[PDB]
Structure 1
């Protein structure tokens, strides 16, 4: 059928099509995008990273890219537009060579040896720095805190971006520094200068009110049980047809629980993290009143994040109903600390807990999530940047500028491959240098002067140099303060590689029904 023909283009098309208008990136280019959907709902969009995550796409190979958009985030946190913009670049090489009648598997074969050639030359042009060296951790994060949300605040975050790691980083070179490693928890209130590196496992949680424990020596709780009480876990001997009977069942409830909440405390507990679920209501809120009065932190229907970290970093297990007391399997805690800064937010700070040699916590604070996310998004990549340096060392320039060094150097090996793929390997070795030109894209008229100048002058940077797409002008892009870890783009290659290759693997007709 001509469908595999027509659709593989339609695959490449609506993949590349959406992805092509997706290049405004890297700098104040084009003009702001206010999106009002096919359902007619106003959105105001910008700064394609979010837009990449915002991206709502009909057609599957377009949906492939939203994935591919998110693919770069956890792999790097940098150059997510990169893997998205270059997605068309592989999609480019497909059709032209599919037109050429090159068997798309050959084109599919053309991706790896390239991906084998390509990421290497990036490593070949890579700029070595360290994973534990606070300065190399600073600079990469610095440039990644320079154009990211906070900079003045990053001056606090950049070291914490670094300081979090030296905990998390396992000795010298080690596979390390995941997102599970640095614990990033928002804290209501304060500001970013209130954002601080709060070491170990620090559980952000909603603890009922105060009169709570801010006091040292918690037994940090994990509790799957109800206090067994009238109207909580224990039978009510009183049926209510009456206001004397209805007032009776809550009194026997509230008068009873007061013993268990202290016994709850009698383990030494300044925390019991309630089961996330309900045994009936699970723990009565009338109970949770007196649990905190004995200074025991309670988050009823506890959020997922604490349960794991407390079972993970702290290593806490559920414990028996305090009628049975407990198994003392409450994880290591020397403190339950609930701090209100701005007077805002309730918290659990656990220091003196089991920790892997990882799980540094950063407690991200602000008068609103704005100030919070201001720090947060910046410090996170700064972590993820340093994370990349950890996961893969050295460096590359920011914004695909080194890819043009690759394009020159690679096309030769593409050429000198002289294989069926070499053609394809040459065709796509030339699909890189577009990316700085194509980010310039949307702004203006009398237009076209710089396009190949966004290219040629780099190609005339020898193989070592080109325009800085972040800062402007030609230099040796790899360290200009136009930088991202070597890890960042070599993934963007790999990430976009098999995605587009999967498009070449689309044949016959598929809609599952």
Structure 2
């Protein structure tokens, strides 16, 4: 009674989210207006930008948002395919619980279906070897030509290949770190000037008297006090004159040189500026003195840059002056401020020693939206190439994996025994919504299209899918649309994980 009712309600909420998102799938896509508290409009063809700003009440909606976020952070694209698989599996679950079979068997059967489906997708895919630049560029162009970012991904794809080659030798199958390869902007500019920056791009400096460039830069990681503390007020006594506060002013003028002499025995060249809530103070009257004898201040550093610079140049994190020893110092090859193709004060660090070969790409553009679209293009390019390199053997897309996987999973349910057999059959014959969604968004009769795909996968080619850029079922064109095999692996595994978790969930309780 109550457990069945609450599971039905959870399934209904998840299916409502999924079917509201179903229309916006794939490169073709169709948008909605978001039901929000401000009343604005959205023309966002994608699916992620709905869940990421969805007013969610039911915990099923929240868990589907976590599903989409996990899929995006894992591999990027497919963020709508995952949620639509989830919704279809929950619809199959609605049917199965309508017949009354128990949720735990549903979870176990879906786990078996997941394992066999991963085996199937690994089987039929093309075992492309990713070891050299020609293979990398082939994978990159196959990944970029199938999306709408092709126009500008062309110039940046070889550079992203260079970056991922810097990170590791592709013979090492370990995944590259998406966060390690940071993306930065230099304000304005052209498009071609977006260039690789080995080392790191750093924030803008203040240039009272500090040098613009230095060979063999001795970068120091500074987080400690600057002055005699102006602890609580600008004046401690009658405000006729600063009779006693002159002491702390000249103590600033003395402690600045005291710390600079404490630095020069180590040789800190640059200064990352932490905010004034951590620092005692920051002002030109002391920053000039630090600058003139080779301590350049760089504005408003943040924790991500601190972690990145620690990972790169080996400077240990610092919270006090006494650790000014060489542990907080790094010795690069060269550090320069470069302003080509439009002036820009962002500092660069070059050729420093690093355990991990962190690399960044600077992004340029005549408009801010162009810069950010280039950033998201390079972001998804790194996502797809990383999920390929860590798993190899990319797969053709366009519902072809769903058709082939549903067919072999239906026959697997045929040969499988026990209660789980019909569960796996329902999983397979409901999972086919993705090609049905492509057919709906392509204008073809969805059911007839799904039947045609299933028939063509039978007794014939298994890579045949629905073509989104020419039209309809196609087999002759191999490059219909291709995604790394990890895209489908993550989709199926996260979808089944969340579905079987939903099945495991019972009797929602307020604290």
TM-score range, shorter chain: 0.7 to 0.9
Distance 2:177 2:59 in 1: 30
Distance change (3 Å), C-alpha of 1:196 and 1:300: closer
2:294 corresponds to = 295
Q: Are the structure 2 counterparts of residues 320 and 10 from structure 1 closer, same or farther at C-alpha, using a change threshold of 3 Å? A: closer
* Closer/same/farther in 2, CA of residues 344 and 458 from structure 1, 3 Å limit: farther
SS at match of 1:215: strand
Match of 1:268 in 2: 267
- The alpha carbon displacement at 1:207 in A equals 5.4
Summarize the Cα distance change of 1:323–1:127 in structure 2 as closer, same or farther, 3 Å threshold. closer
Query: Is contact 2:146–2:482 with CA below 8 Å preserved after alignment?
Result: no
Secondary structure of 2:327 counterpart: coil
Q: Secondary structure of the equivalent of 1:116? A: helix
- Seen in structure 2, the aligned counterparts of structure 1 residues 384 and 470 have a Cα distance that, compared at 3 Å, is farther
Are residues 187 and 477 of structure 1, via their aligned partners in 2, closer, same or farther at CA, if it must alter by over 3 Å?
farther
Say if 1:318 and 1:409 are closer, same or farther in 2 by CA, change over 3 A. closer
Deviation (angstroms), 1:98? 1.0
Over 3 Å counting, the alpha-carbon distance change for 1:273 and 1:3 in structure 2 is: same
- What is the CA distance between 1:271 and its match in structure 2? 1.4
Deviation by residue 1:180-206 (Cα, 9 ceiling, x = unmatched): 332323333333312111113444566
Give yes or no for contact 1:271–1:297 (8 Å, CA) kept in 2. Answer: yes
Q: Distance in 2 between matches of 1:266 and 1:60?
A: 59
Report deviation, 1:179: 0.8
Contact 2:404-2:454 at 8 Å conserved across structures? no
CA contact (8 A) 2:402 2:431 kept: yes
- 1:436 Cα deviation from its structure 2 partner: 1.8
In structure 2, relative to structure 1, the CA distance for the partners of 1:103 and 1:379 (3 Å cut) is same
Compute the displacement of 1:103 (Å).
Answer: 0.8
User: Secondary structure of the residue that 2:321 maps to in structure 1?
Assistant: coil
What's the secondary structure of 2:120's corresponding residue?
helix
The change in CA–CA distance for 1:190 and 1:132 in structure 2 (over 3 A counts) is farther
- CA pair 432-133 structure 1, distance change in 2 beyond 3 A: farther
343-352 or 118-127: bigger deviation: 343-352
> Which of 348-357 and 200-209 deviates more?
200-209
The one-character-per-residue Cα deviations of 1:215-237 (angstroms, maximum 9, x if unpaired) are 22222121121233475999999
Judged with a 3 Å threshold, the aligned counterparts in structure 2 of structure 1 residues 132 and 80 are, in CA distance, closer, same or farther, namely farther
Structure-2-length-normalised TM-score = 0.87
Residue 281 of structure 1 is matched in structure 2 by 280
1:82-102 alpha-carbon deviations (Å, 9 max, x no partner): 112211121122111111211
Structure 1 pair 368–439 and aligned structure 2 pair: CA distance change class (3 A): same
Tell me if the contact between 1:140 and 1:385 (Cα under 8 Å) persists in the aligned partners: no
1:232 and 1:300 mapped to 2: Cα distance? Answer: 22
Task: Give the whole-Å Cα distance in 2 for the aligned partners of 1:335 and 1:212.
Answer: 13
**Alpha-carbon separation, structure 1, partners of 2:479 and 2:167:** 28
Between 449-458 and 20-29, report the one with greater CA deviation: 449-458
Residues 444-477 of structure 1 deviation map (CA, whole Å, 9 limit, x = unaligned): 7999865645665555755442333455343449
Classify the secondary structure of the residue corresponding to 2:201.
strand
> Structure 1 residues 218, 183: CA separation in 2 closer, same or farther (over 3 Å shift)?
same
Decide whether aligned partners of structure 1 residues 344 and 209 sit closer, same or farther in structure 2, where only a CA change above 3 A counts.
Answer: farther
Shift of 1:345: 3.9
Which stretch shifts more, 8-17 or 469-478? Answer: 469-478
CA contact (8 A) 1:161 1:380 kept: no
The range that moved more, 493-502 or 330-339, is: 330-339
Offset at 1:356?
2.2
Query: Comparing 120-129 with 205-214, which one deviates more in the overlay?
Result: 205-214
Instruction: Provide the C-alpha distance between the structure 1 equivalents of 2:177 and 2:469, rounded to a whole number of angstroms.
Output: 27
Secondary structure of the residue aligned to 2:118 is helix
| 1:397–1:478 Cα contact (<8 Å) kept | no
Change (3 A) 1:485 1:408: same
Bigger drift between 410-419 and 133-142 goes to 133-142
How many residues were matched structurally?
511
Please, which moves more after superposition, 28-37 or 238-247? 238-247
CA-CA distance at 1:178 after TM superposition: 1.6
In structure 2, runs of 5+ residues without a counterpart are none
CA 1:478–1:21 in 2, change beyond 3 Å: closer, same or farther? farther
Tell which deviates more after alignment, 107-116 or 252-261: 252-261
| Cα pair 1:65 1:84 within 8 Å, conserved | yes
Relative to structure 1, the CA distance from residue 384 to residue 477 in structure 2 (aligned partners, 3 Å threshold; closer, same or farther) is farther
Report the alpha carbon displacement of residue 276 of structure 1 after superposing the two structures with TM: 5.3
Sort the Cα spacing of 1:120 and 1:206 in 2 relative to 1 into closer, same or farther, 3 A: farther
Residue 281 of structure 1 and its aligned partner are, at CA, apart by 3.1
Distance 1:262 1:189, change over 3 A: farther
C-alpha distance in 2 between matches for 1:287 and 1:296:
11
Higher mean C-alpha displacement, 160-169 vs 239-248: 239-248
Gaps of 5+ in 1: none
Kept after mapping to 1: 8 A contact 2:137/2:158: yes
Could you say if the C-alpha distance between residues 90 and 246 of structure 1 is closer, same or farther in structure 2, counting changes exceeding 3 Å?
A: same
Contact 2:173 2:391 survives alignment (8 Å):
no
> Hey, what does 2:200 align to over in structure 1?
201
- Give the Å deviation of 1:323: 9.1
8 Å contact from structure 1 (residues 227, 322) kept in 2:
no
Structure-2 change in CA distance of 1:464 and 1:278 (3 Å): closer
Whether the 8 Å CA contact 2:199–2:358 is kept in 1: the answer is: yes
Assess, with a 3 A threshold, how the Cα gap between structure 1 residues 234 and 278 changes in structure 2: closer, same or farther: same
